[PDB]
Amino acid sequence: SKYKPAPLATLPSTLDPAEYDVSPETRRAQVERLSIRARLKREYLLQYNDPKRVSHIEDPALIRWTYARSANIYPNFRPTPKNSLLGAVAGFGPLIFWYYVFKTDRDRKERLIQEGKLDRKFNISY
Amino acid sequence: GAHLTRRYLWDASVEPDPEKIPSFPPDLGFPERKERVMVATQQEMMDAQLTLQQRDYCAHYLIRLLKCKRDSFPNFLACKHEQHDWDYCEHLDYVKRMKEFERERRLLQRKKRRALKEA
Amino acid sequence: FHMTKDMLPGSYPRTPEERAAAAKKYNMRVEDYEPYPDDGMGYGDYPMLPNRSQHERDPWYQWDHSELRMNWGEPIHWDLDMYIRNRVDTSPTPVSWDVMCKHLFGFVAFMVFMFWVGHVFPSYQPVGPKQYPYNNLYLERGGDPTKEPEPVVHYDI
Amino acid sequence: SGYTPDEKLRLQQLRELRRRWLKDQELSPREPVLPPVFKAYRSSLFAVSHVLIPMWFVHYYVKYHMATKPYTIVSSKPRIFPGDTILETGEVIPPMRDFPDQHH
Amino acid sequence: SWDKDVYPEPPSRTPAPSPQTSLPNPITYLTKAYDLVVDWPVTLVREFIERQHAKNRTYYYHRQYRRVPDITECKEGDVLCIYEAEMQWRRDFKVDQEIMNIIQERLKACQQREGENYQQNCAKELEQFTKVTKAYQDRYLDLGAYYSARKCLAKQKQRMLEERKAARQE
Amino acid sequence: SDAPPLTLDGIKDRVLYVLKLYDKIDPEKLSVNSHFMKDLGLDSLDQVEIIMAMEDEFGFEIPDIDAEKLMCPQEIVDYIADKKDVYE
Amino acid sequence: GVHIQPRYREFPQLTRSQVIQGEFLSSLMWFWILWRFWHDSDAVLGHFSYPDPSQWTDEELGIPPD
Amino acid sequence: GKMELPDYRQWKIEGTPLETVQKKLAARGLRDPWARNEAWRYMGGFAGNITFPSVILKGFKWGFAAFVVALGAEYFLD
Amino acid sequence: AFCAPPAYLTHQQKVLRLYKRALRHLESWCIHRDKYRYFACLMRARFEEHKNEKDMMRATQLLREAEEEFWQNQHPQPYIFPDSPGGTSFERYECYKVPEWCLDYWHPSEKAMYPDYFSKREQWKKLRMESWDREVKQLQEETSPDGIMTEALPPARREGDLPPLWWHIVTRPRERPT
Amino acid sequence: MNIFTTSILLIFILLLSPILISMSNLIKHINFPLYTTTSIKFSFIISLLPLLMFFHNNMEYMITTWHWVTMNSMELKMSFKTDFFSILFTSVALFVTWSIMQFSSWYMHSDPNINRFIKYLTLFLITMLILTSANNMFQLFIGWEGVGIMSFLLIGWWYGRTDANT
Amino acid sequence: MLCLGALTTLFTAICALTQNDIKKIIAFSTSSQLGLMMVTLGMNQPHLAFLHICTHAFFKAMLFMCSGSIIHSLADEQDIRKMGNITKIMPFTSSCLVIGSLALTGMPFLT
Amino acid sequence: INENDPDLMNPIKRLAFGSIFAGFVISYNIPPTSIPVLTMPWFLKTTALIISVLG
Ligand SMILES: CCCCCCCCCCCCO[C@@H]1O[C@H](CO)[C@@H](O[C@H]2O[C@H](CO)[C@@H](O)[C@H](O)[C@H]2O)[C@H](O)[C@H]1O
């Protein structure tokens, strides 16, 4: 029996111990969260239903997300031993691996052509 | 079949290897064994446009079946006899191949018997 | 523009007063807000939100962003576009992730193993090889007419 | 529990408006105001326009633009059996041998 | 029409026919209806067109190029002589491409024509395609995107020197 | 497709029809405004089954958040009418 | 299109056409199966006898005595 | 028009499989208050049993009838 | 879909939701109606035996163990109504739910084909424009002092007032639009 | 070989005419689903003639209708392999499609874009016949990728549904 | 080809045994028949694998048509757990459904 | 339930005929191709029918 969560198969709420907690500390957090959601919902709806609106509704959360994933990246980058090692391996690693695949293969192909044991029968286009 | 559960789950030296048939010389046991006869000429099979799979020792019966089908068109049910003749010839050919498998199975039995006596 | 620097993502919050200002920026509670670890990988103070796909958002609630199942104004997960309902699903399954992986690769490994068994113990009929006339159709198969073939003779059994 | 007395009231007011909006979606008799032979014959006239006439154009192209160019229409050879006569030459193919017959 | 020598076609050999059954062959009747409803009106339109063509008969000619000195006879750095020789080589290279296309066209037509007999009755077309392909590879293989008369000549001399070396050792 | 459109009277008839086949309700004292808990004396577990029988009757689901508030047959009729855009 | 009226909780009324056409095709299937099985039973049960290898004499197979 | 519903008083579980279920429940002190809501599925035109042979052998009778008439023709045209 | 959820579910709400799920997954296992009715009554008896548990801490523990039991006895492929989340017809008609503001771009030749519809639409637009200012004021007036807020909206208290934020509810596309 | 060749080419022409009509203003003055079913119905009937001539003489064809472009010593030609596999698949596919297209009229009667649905099914059939009659791999790859795109458009027909687009 | 086809013909037959969507059962039927075509190709029987394409096209299209007939009449319901008794209430669709199933399962002398 | 439209019944009826007769008509018209093996034990000849019925 028993369900073991995984990152791609998460724990159900019904099996979550934190869903059955009724302590006033938690209930105050849950009420506080809904107050934030309700105020945001009200602001959105007042814009949405306003009969004088002429344009779409600006979405500051989406602007922050797209900003965080582009312009904000480099100012918040710090070279660390893990960054540097990862950058060098990811950046150059595949380049070196594929160099030896193509170089080794093409060296052998030339070796066979010089000494006549490459079967070029009908190959006339290249 | 039984032949598979004997080659496996048992000894295999007395059971034929399906790719190594015929293992023994053809004359062994037949004094003047006759070569198989082929009715259809190479030209006839070529002109009838038989596929190489179809150019076996029954091609003459296949050639009439094809001939009948072309003549009997549009009546596509009129070639029942010729189809039966071709099928029967292929059946005898198949039995012939069953005899060869049985012949080798018995020769390998004899080889195991006469080898035991030698030592 | 509307987005002043105080309304846009910034650098990692270093003081509890900067943590509070960041939480207010992202419409979160200070206790709920937490940034990514300070690794210098470019996250800054962007909130580190739980790794659940939008498949797990309540499908009956009337979300402002209907398809995304997001409300307007709430902070967007860093990998939202990976977690949209057209892409990666993290929703709970009736069977544990580990059990599915064991059964799937157990089934695959068993079948692959035992195709090999069927290869070394083939099924065939007690029949000799098919025979073809004319030196096994040497000319028809493309053999050179000039060179004499090696004779192949079949007998009547 | 059930609707609060305020929830009951709101749903009543929206229900009155929604049902009026849905009623308004109906079209009047004049709307939309749009500005202004036996069977088998219909099968016949379709055939002329969508079989006969295109077949004149396709046959023209095949006869006088494809059959007039080498190797554009290449057929496999017809089957010739023992005992046939070839029209182009007139030769007769010799019959086959004798097997001799067999019975199932 | 076309040249039966460039694009050879074997003569047709169509059987009788010799129908056995008493049923009527639908293809025979459909062809007669087709030859009346479809073939006959199309021929009249074509014959009208051909009659108009003969009243406005014009002619065109296949262009002839006189040979110019080869790249072998050009002094290096002589751009005027190299240009004419190089342009001649490009014309010949193009004509070689179409000779390959003709030989492949014969091969494909013969395979289709021979059907189940292609492995035996295509021997001459397959051998010509093999010979003409060998000759093509010797002239042009590995010249590269900047192929030219100078590179073709350098490729030939490299092959000739190797052939000579092998023969001398013999 | 071939099904007729729903009607306010048609929904009402089938909502009361389903309730008349519930042994824990006497048909005679059932009206559109009969509160399930007060007037009819049914507990909360019963109200779950009444909604589950309504979903089966009309072939569509009522979310739990909305179902928990339907405490008389007229509320059920109103809910089905607003879901299916019934207006007369 | 015949405009069948809907029914509530009762078995509906079936038109003659959908019953007859449904019955004709089922009957056509069984006529064909029986008519074919009458004429081509060997295609299901086999036609040619399968020989028994063991009952082939050593003289047929050219087995020399040990 | 206006669809008229059948009288609800007719949906009685007597003689149907739902009665067998009520017997089993009554043994342990329970009864099904919704059993009449399902009774329409078991009575009327829906009453009966559908055996797998009956579904497969639909049309066998007239298929076999036509079979002997056609067989009669072949034993007469020949 | 019409009512917003609360901050948290009371213990009673969680139990009644498990009851509805448990029956629905039972129905998926049983298929046949007589079999389902038998086991549906057995299922209710299990919820009844602990109905009057007054411990709370035991009641919460009984909820835990039932939910753990549900996950193990869950149907892998439960029945879903065709229009429900995960059903086969879910969101099938969203490509046909054209919002009403699209009509503001119709050409006059397009509008001339429905002279009566577009006269009524003007009345609904005039009604909307007049009511907006009162609607905004009512929501401002009815804000609670303590920050605790919910998504529930008030009705129209006075006469001639429409409930605040009604346009997106009242004028929404039909379920079956075309 | 003129009647045979004409029949093979006429099948494609008949299947294009519903596509051609869709681009005109004539599509809204006719019953388009009925017109498209008739075009496919006739196209099946025409396809029975090459089926009969093959059943008779078993002759196979390589048909070239258009020279597209020569890449030095490689000529790309629109060409057709009209053999056993192609002749019989054409007759079977046209027959089945004739049933599907008539059925779609009843099944999708309430869809406001029935005309586009009918058009997409016709395009799928054209790409499938390109796929099964092609004499060369490039022409085959046209049909191979064509049916992929048409299946994508038809699977995701109700495009407001997230699950359909996935 | 032989082993790939055989794995597909079994794997998708297992999947179909417990499906509840009528269209999913028929879909997995298709993958299982395609696996059998791939097995036939692996035995060096290209013309038999092609002849199964042509015969398969008939009864499978009918099966989908008949299920679409049922789905349409039951208000877009595809789950078999909410069907039942179709043999009596839809006589024509049921008869063609049984004909198609008998052709799929190899009933003698059907397609 | 309404299955009386001709646009539903005729297309299905056309494919029901194909599902009964098409195999027979195609099988007897196509040219011979691969040589079938028609010699085998009774249990190999009837294997398809037996396992289908057993299923
Ligand atoms: C595919 C393309 C490949 C891209 C390159 C991949 C390799 C990346 C690894 C580079 C390793 C060198 O990484 C090096 O780390 C140090 C660590 O402080 C950084 O140093 C950083 O802090 C120092 C202070 O100490 C400053 O003087 C410096 O200007 C600042 O960048 C260097 O600026 C960076 O260049």
Ligand SMILES: CCCCCCCCCCCCO[C@@H]1O[C@H](CO)[C@@H](O[C@H]2O[C@H](CO)[C@@H](O)[C@H](O)[C@H]2O)[C@H](O)[C@H]1O
């Ligand atoms: C050579 C080819 C031969 C083709 C053969 C075609 C035969 C055609 C027969 C059509 C039959 C029509 O006759 C039809 O018979 C069935 C009997 O099943 C009757 O059907 C009645 O009895 C049957 C029992 O068999 C019940 O299953 C059914 O519910 C009931 O309605 C129909 O009311 C009647 O209309």
Ligand SMILES: *C(=O)CCCCCCCCCCCCC
């Ligand atoms: C020996 O002949 C090997 C052939 C493979 C046998 C596989 C099993 C086939 C099942 C036959 C049904 C038996 C009915 C008595």
